[PDB]
C-alpha cells in the first residue's frame, strides 16, 4: 500500500490495525471491507448523489463548491455509477432525477450485439417512425435491451 | 450438465464459430475446384485431398448444425419476448380476441389465439399479472363464460406441450431462422449429395454487413426494380408481338438457306429467340438480319429495328442504371440523415445544435449527460430492479404512466437550463 | 528507385508516370474519387468475382459439353471439365464477352435442357450486366457526387 | 427529379398545413400538437 502511495501512512496503519493482525499479522481483502464497504459505498453513493443534486438544484455556491471538491474522489468514482435522468412528472418544471446506474448492468450494456441493434435501432427511427410512439418504441426497443442483457448475464 | 454447458457455451462462443464457418465455406470453395470427368477428384501434392475433403464437408454440416443450436440459443428469447409482449399488451390494451376479433391477415396473430389458454402463456414478457388483470378488467363485464374461454427422459408427455407447441409454430415463423435453417439443409444435401454442398455461399450475404448494403440497395427498391423489369420483358414482349408481324421470313440462323432457314413463324419461339437475342445480342436485334437489298419493306425493317434496338438501349438500361445509382443514393440519403439528426437533435431532446452550443461545449455534454439514451433505459432497468414499494413515488409514479404507457413523463426535450437560462 | 531501375534496366525507365497521379492535383481529385469510396470499390469487385464464381459454379454442373472453341468438333471440343479452367475460361468470357456468356454456346436445337440453357445463361448475362454496371456506374458517379 | 418531387411532398406534409403553412415547429413546442394541429387545426376534408 506504501508503494501505491494512495494513503496518509497515519491511516494505513490506521487500516492495518484495522484490518485483521492475524495468523501471523496477515489479512485478507475481502471479509475486511467488502460486506460493509460495498453498502457504504452505495451510501456515499448516495451522499454524492445528494451533494450533486445540490449543485444541480443550487449552483454557484462556493461553500458548497468547497464541500464538493473536498469530497470529489467520490464524485470521481460514481460518476458512470451514478444514475441521473430528466422528466417532467407533473411538478411542471423541467425536472431532472437522479438515481443508481448498476455497473454490472453497463456491462451488460457492454455487449457490443447491444450497441449495434441500439445503431440499427437509432436508423430505425431517424428514418421513419411517428414523433408520438417514438418514445413509446424506444422505450419498446429499451425493454427488449432489458430482456437481452437478462440473456446475457445469465452466460 | 453436458446439454446446458454447451447451451451456455454456444451462448458465449457463437458468432466466432459463425465467423468459422465463413471461413471453412472459402476452404470449400478453395478445392471444388478440382473436378474432373463417372466424377472424381484430382490429386496434387498435397496427400490429403479427399479425406480431408470428406472430414471438412461432413464437418461443416456439423459446423451449421452447431450454429443452429447456438441460434435456438440465440435471440429466440427476444424473439418470443417481443412476441409475448405484442400479444399480452393487445390483450392489455386492446383485449384483441375478447371484442376485437382481428382479420384473416396475420394469423402470426390469430395462431395466439389457442396459446392464451396455454396456462404458461405469458412466460418470456415475465408477466404473469396480464391474465388475471385482463379476467378482471375486460372479462367481468363480458363474463365468466369470457374467463372460461380464456382460462379454459421422464417427463415427455406430462406437460403444457401445446404451449410448446405454439411455440414452435411461432419459431417456424422467422425469417432469420428459416434462412440459417434453409442453409443447414444445404449442409445435410450436401451430406447426400456432396456437389450441390459448394452451393452455401448465400451466407455472406448477410456475412459482412457492408455486402448486405450492397444487397440492400438492391432489394429495397427492389419492388419497384422487379416489377419494372417484369414490365420491361412485356415491351419486349410486344415487341417482338410488332417484330413478327410484317417481317416473317427474313432473318435466319441459317447456312445461307442450305440448312433450312431459322425465321420463327412459332409466334413463341420466336418471342424466345428475339428475347435471347435482346437478352445477349449486344448490338441489337440487327445483327441476324439480311443485307438491306432496299425492299420498300426493308427502308422499313432496317429503320424500325435500328431505332428499335436502339429504343431497347433507352429503356432498360435507363431502368438499369437510374434504378441502381438511384438506390445507391437513397441508401446515402439515409445515413446522411442519420449523422444529421444524431449531431441536431437528441431523441429526448429534439430541440437542436443551436441552444446547446450558446452553452459553448453544451451540446458534446447535452448528448453525453442530458438525454444520455442508454441512462433512460438504465433507469427502467432501475424500475425493473425495484419495488414499487420500494420505488420513490417519483419512480412509481413514472412508473404509474408506464402502467398507462403515456410517455408525458418524458419532456418536449427542453432541459434543465431551458425552464430558467 | 524506378529510376534507379532505369539505370539498369531503360526500358521500365519509363515506369515513372504514376508520378502525375500526384502531380497536377485536380487529377489527384480523380484518383481520390477513385479511392475515397475505394474500400467498398474493390471489397465490392472481389464480391461480384466471387458472383462470377459462383456462378460459374453454377455454370457448369449441367452444362458440361456444350460450348467449344474448337473447330466444329474436329479439332479437339474445348469444353471444361476441369473446374478451374473453367472459372478461367467462364470470368474470361463473362468479362471481355460483350453479349454475356451467350457468345459461346450450342445455337438451341431445342433439348429440353437447352431451353434452360438458353433462357438461363441470356438472363444471367443479363444478370451480370445488371449487377456489375451497377457496382460501376453507381460507386463512381456517387463518388463524384 | 421523381424522387424530388415527392421527398418535398413528404416534407411539406410534416412541416406545414396548406391552410396552416408555419412549420412542424410552434406545434411541437405544443408536444403532439402537430398531431393534432394536422387533424384538427387545418384537417384539410373539413373546411371542404
Ligand atoms: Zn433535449
Ligand atoms: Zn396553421
Same mark, same amino acid.
Given at each position: 500500500?506504501?508503494?501505491?502511495?494512495?494513503?496518509?501512512?497515519?491511516?494505513?496503519?490506521?487500516?492495518?490495525?484495522?484490518?485483521?493482525?492475524?495468523?501471523?499479522?496477515?489479512?485478507?481483502?475481502?471479509?475486511?471491507?467488502?460486506?460493509?464497504?460495498?453498502?457504504?459505498?452505495?451510501?456515499?453513493?448516495?451522499?454524492?448523489?445528494?451533494?450533486?443534486?445540490?449543485?444541480?438544484?443550487?449552483?454557484?455556491?462556493?461553500?458548497?463548491?468547497?464541500?464538493?471538491?473536498?469530497?470529489?474522489?467520490?464524485?470521481?468514482?460514481?460518476?458512470?455509477?451514478?444514475?441521473?435522468?430528466?422528466?417532467?412528472?407533473?411538478?411542471?418544471?423541467?425536472?431532472?432525477?437522479?438515481?443508481?446506474?448498476?455497473?454490472?448492468?453497463?456491462?451488460?450494456?457492454?455487449?457490443?450485439?447491444?450497441?449495434?441493434?441500439?445503431?440499427?435501432?437509432?436508423?430505425?427511427?431517424?428514418?421513419?417512425?411517428?414523433?408520438?410512439?417514438?418514445?413509446?418504441?424506444?422505450?419498446?426497443?429499451?425493454?427488449?435491451?432489458?430482456?437481452?442483457?437478462?440473456?446475457?448475464?445469465?452466460? | 450438465?453436458?446439454?446446458?454447458?454447451?447451451?451456455?457455451?454456444?451462448?458465449?462462443?457463437?458468432?466466432?464459430?459463425?465467423?468459422?464457418?465463413?471461413?471453412?465455406?472459402?476452404?470449400?470453395?478453395?478445392?471444388?475446384?478440382?473436378?474432373?470427368?463417372?466424377?472424381?477428384?484430382?490429386?496434387?501434392?498435397?496427400?490429403?485431398?479427399?479425406?480431408?475433403?470428406?472430414?471438412?464437408?461432413?464437418?461443416?454440416?456439423?459446423?451449421?448444425?452447431?450454429?443452429?443450436?447456438?441460434?435456438?440459443?440465440?435471440?429466440?428469447?427476444?424473439?418470443?419476448?417481443?412476441?409475448?409482449?405484442?400479444?399480452?399488451?393487445?390483450?392489455?390494451?386492446?383485449?384483441?380476441?375478447?371484442?376485437?376479433?382481428?382479420?384473416?391477415?396475420?394469423?402470426?396473430?390469430?395462431?395466439?389465439?389457442?396459446?392464451?389458454?396455454?396456462?404458461?402463456?405469458?412466460?418470456?414478457?415475465?408477466?404473469?399479472?396480464?391474465?388475471?388483470?385482463?379476467?378482471?378488467?375486460?372479462?367481468?363485464?363480458?363474463?365468466?363464460?369470457?374467463?372460461?374461454?380464456?382460462?379454459?427422459?421422464?417427463?415427455?408427455?406430462?406437460?403444457?406441450?401445446?404451449?410448446?407447441?405454439?411455440?414452435?409454430?411461432?419459431?417456424?415463423?422467422?425469417?432469420?431462422?428459416?434462412?440459417?435453417?434453409?442453409?443447414?439443409?444445404?449442409?445435410?444435401?450436401?451430406?447426400?449429395?456432396?456437389?450441390?454442398? /459448394?452451393?452455401?455461399?448465400?451466407? %455472406?450475404?448477410?456475412? @459482412?454487413?457492408? &455486402? +448486405?448494403?450492397?444487397?440492400?440497395? $438492391?432489394?429495397?427498391?427492389?419492388?419497384?426494380?422487379?416489377?419494372?423489369?417484369?414490365?420491361?420483358?412485356?415491351?419486349?414482349?410486344?415487341?417482338?408481338?410488332?417484330?413478327?408481324?410484317?417481317?416473317?421470313?427474313?432473318?435466319?440462323?441459317?447456312?445461307?438457306?442450305?440448312?433450312?432457314?431459322?425465321?420463327?413463324?412459332?409466334?413463341?419461339?420466336?418471342?424466345?429467340?428475339?428475347?435471347?437475342?435482346?437478352?445477349?445480342?449486344?448490338?441489337?436485334?440487327?445483327?441476324?438480319?439480311?443485307?438491306?437489298?432496299?425492299?420498300?419493306?426493308?427502308?422499313?425493317?432496317?429503320?424500325?429495328?435500328?431505332?428499335?434496338?436502339?429504343?431497347?438501349?433507352?429503356?432498360?438500361? /435507363?431502368?438499369?442504371?437510374?434504378? %441502381?445509382?438511384?438506390? @445507391?443514393?437513397? &441508401? +446515402?440519403?439515409?445515413?446522411?440523415? $442519420?449523422?444529421?439528426?444524431?449531431?441536431?437533435?437528441?431523441?429526448?431532446?429534439?430541440?437542436?445544435?443551436?441552444?446547446?452550443?450558446?452553452?459553448?461545449?453544451?451540446?458534446?455534454?447535452?448528448?453525453?449527460?442530458?438525454?444520455?439514451?442508454?441512462?433512460?433505459?438504465?433507469?427502467?432497468?432501475?424500475?425493473?430492479?425495484?419495488?414499487?414499494?420500494?420505488?420513490?413515488?417519483?419512480?412509481?409514479?413514472?412508473?404509474?404512466?408506464?402502467?398507462?404507457?403515456?410517455?408525458?413523463?418524458?419532456?418536449?426535450?427542453?432541459?434543465?437550463?431551458?425552464?430558467?437560462?
Amino acid at each position: 500500500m506504501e508503494s501505491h502511495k494512495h494513503y496518509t501512512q497515519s491511516e494505513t496503519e490506521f487500516l492495518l490495525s484495522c484490518a485483521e493482525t492475524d495468523e501471523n499479522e496477515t489479512l485478507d481483502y475481502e471479509e475486511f471491507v467488502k460486506r460493509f464497504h460495498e453498502p457504504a459505498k452505495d451510501i456515499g453513493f448516495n451522499v454524492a448523489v445528494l451533494l450533486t443534486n445540490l449543485s444541480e438544484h443550487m449552483p454557484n455556491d462556493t461553500r458548497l463548491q468547497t464541500f464538493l471538491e473536498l469530497a470529489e474522489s467520490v464524485l470521481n468514482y460514481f460518476q458512470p455509477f451514478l444514475g441521473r435522468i430528466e422528466i417532467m412528472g407533473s411538478a411542471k418544471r423541467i425536472e431532472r432525477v437522479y438515481f443508481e446506474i448498476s455497473e454490472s448492468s453497463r456491462t451488460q450494456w457492454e455487449k457490443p450485439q447491444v450497441k449495434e441493434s441500439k445503431r440499427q435501432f437509432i436508423f430505425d427511427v431517424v428514418n421513419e417512425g411517428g414523433e408520438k410512439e417514438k418514445m413509446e418504441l424506444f422505450v419498446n426497443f429499451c425493454e427488449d435491451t432489458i430482456f437481452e442483457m437478462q440473456l446475457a448475464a445469465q452466460i | 450438465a453436458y446439454q446446458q454447458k454447451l447451451l451456455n457455451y454456444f451462448a458465449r462462443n457463437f458468432y466466432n464459430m459463425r465467423m468459422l464457418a465463413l471461413f471453412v465455406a472459402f476452404a470449400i470453395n478453395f478445392i471444388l475446384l478440382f473436378y474432373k470427368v463417372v466424377h472424381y477428384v484430382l490429386e496434387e501434392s498435397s496427400g490429403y485431398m479427399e479425406p480431408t475433403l470428406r472430414i471438412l464437408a461432413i464437418l461443416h454440416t456439423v459446423i451449421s448444425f452447431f450454429c443452429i443450436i447456438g441460434y435456438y440459443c440465440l435471440k429466440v428469447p427476444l424473439v418470443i419476448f417481443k412476441r409475448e409482449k405484442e400479444v399480452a399488451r393487445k390483450l392489455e390494451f386492446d383485449g384483441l380476441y375478447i371484442t376485437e376479433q382481428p382479420s384473416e391477415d396475420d394469423i402470426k396473430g390469430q395462431w395466439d389465439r389457442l396459446v392464451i389458454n396455454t396456462q404458461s402463456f405469458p412466460n418470456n414478457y415475465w408477466d404473469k399479472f396480464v391474465k388475471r388483470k385482463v379476467m378482471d378488467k375486460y372479462g367481468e363485464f363480458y363474463g365468466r363464460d369470457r374467463i372460461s374461454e380464456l382460462l379454459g427422459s421422464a417427463v415427455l408427455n406430462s406437460i403444457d406441450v401445446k404451449y410448446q407447441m405454439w411455440k414452435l409454430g411461432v419459431v417456424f415463423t422467422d425469417n432469420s431462422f428459416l434462412y440459417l435453417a434453409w442453409y443447414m439443409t444445404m449442409s445435410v444435401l450436401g451430406h447426400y449429395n456432396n456437389f450441390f454442398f /459448394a452451393a452455401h455461399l448465400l451466407d %455472406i450475404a448477410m456475412g @459482412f454487413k457492408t &455486402l +448486405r448494403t450492397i444487397l440492400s440497395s $438492391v432489394t429495397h427498391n427492389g419492388k419497384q426494380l422487379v416489377l419494372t423489369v417484369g414490365l420491361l420483358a412485356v415491351v419486349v414482349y410486344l415487341y417482338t408481338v410488332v417484330a413478327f408481324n410484317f417481317f416473317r421470313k427474313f432473318y435466319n440462323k441459317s447456312e445461307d438457306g442450305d440448312t433450312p432457314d431459322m425465321k420463327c413463324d412459332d409466334m413463341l419461339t420466336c418471342y424466345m429467340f428475339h428475347m435471347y437475342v435482346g437478352v445477349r445480342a449486344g448490338g441489337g436485334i440487327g445483327d441476324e438480319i439480311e443485307d438491306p437489298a432496299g425492299d420498300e419493306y426493308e427502308i422499313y425493317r432496317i429503320i424500325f429495328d435500328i431505332t428499335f434496338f436502339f429504343f431497347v438501349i433507352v429503356i432498360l438500361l /435507363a431502368i438499369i442504371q437510374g434504378l %441502381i445509382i438511384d438506390a @445507391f443514393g437513397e &441508401l +446515402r440519403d439515409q445515413q446522411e440523415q $442519420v449523422k444529421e439528426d444524431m449531431e441536431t437533435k437528441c431523441f429526448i431532446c429534439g430541440i437542436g445544435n443551436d441552444y446547446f452550443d450558446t452553452v459553448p461545449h453544451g451540446f458534446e455534454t447535452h448528448t453525453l449527460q442530458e438525454h444520455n439514451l442508454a441512462n433512460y433505459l438504465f433507469f427502467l432497468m432501475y424500475l425493473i430492479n425495484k419495488d414499487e414499494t420500494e420505488h420513490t413515488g417519483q419512480e412509481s409514479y413514472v412508473w404509474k404512466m408506464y402502467q398507462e404507457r403515456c410517455w408525458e413523463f418524458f419532456p418536449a426535450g427542453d432541459c434543465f437550463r431551458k425552464q430558467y437560462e
